[PDB]
Write a protein that binds this ligand. Structure first.
Ligand SMILES: CC(C)=CCC/C(C)=C/CC/C(C)=C/CC/C(C)=C/CC/C(C)=C/CC/C(C)=C/CC/C(C)=C/CC/C(C)=C/COP(=O)(O)OP(=O)(O)O
Length: 174
């Protein structure tokens, strides 16, 4: 039973790599799914096969050697939500929510303690986004070896193991 469903088309989630001397590139996942149950569990499922770095060979290397998508096709975030506090938002009103979100990525579940911005857009639609810049450390999900494979394949000197993540999620009630 769902209180909300993710609007997958309108929603997005991006991450930024840095290589060499602070050479930044923003990548995205083209396919997201999710919803919020009537029991107050929000989920975001990130299709790791939908990684889009703008370069097909690189996408393949990220699927095969970083995320290892034959084993790990999706990353799943789960967050307890107060549905009454969401219901209580007036149209156009926001609130800050301090969450302990569980991220299941690359076989290593971890908790992300962060703050989300939740804004009501209409009687049925809400927008959820990271309130501040959100950094993921590859080592927290056993992803450093994959980064080293990508580095060595590219003949690069350095690839940063810290990755900023940004998202804007739209959820819609029945
Ligand atoms: C109402 C309410 C509150 C609802 C809640 C809604 C909800 C569920 C919200 C979500 C909450 C939260 C906190 C979600 C968490 C989101 C996160 C953090 C998801 C994880 C995203 C993710 C999988 C990110 C990737 C992580 C990592 C570490 C990736 C590593 C990337 C990396 C460094 C890649 C290297 C790429 C490079 C540079 C390759 C070199 O090749 P190339 O560039 O071709 O070389 P050359 O220079 O030769 O050209």
């Amino acid at each position: 039973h769902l209180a909300y469903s993710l609007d997958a088309t309108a929603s997005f989630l991006n991450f930024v790599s840095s290589k060499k001397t602070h050479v930044l590139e923003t990548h995205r996942f083209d396919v997201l799914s999710g919803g919020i149950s009537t029991a107050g569990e929000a989920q975001l499922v990130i299709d790791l096969n939908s990684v889009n770095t703008g370069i097909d060979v690189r996408n393949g290397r990220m699927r095969d050697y970083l995320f290892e998508t034959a084993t790990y096709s999706v990353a799943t975030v789960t967050v307890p939500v107060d549905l009454a506090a969401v219901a209580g938002l007036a149209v156009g009103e926001d609130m800050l929510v301090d969450v302990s979100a569980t991220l299941d990525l690359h076989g290593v579940p971890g908790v992300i303690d962060t703050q989300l911005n939740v804004q009501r857009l209409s009687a049925t639609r809400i927008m959820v986004q990271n309130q501040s810049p959100l950094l993921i450390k590859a080592a927290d999900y056993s992803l450093e070896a994959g980064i080293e494979t990508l580095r060595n394949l590219a003949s690069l000197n350095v690839i940063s193991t810290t990755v900023p993540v940004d998202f804007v999620l739209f959820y819609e009630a029945p």
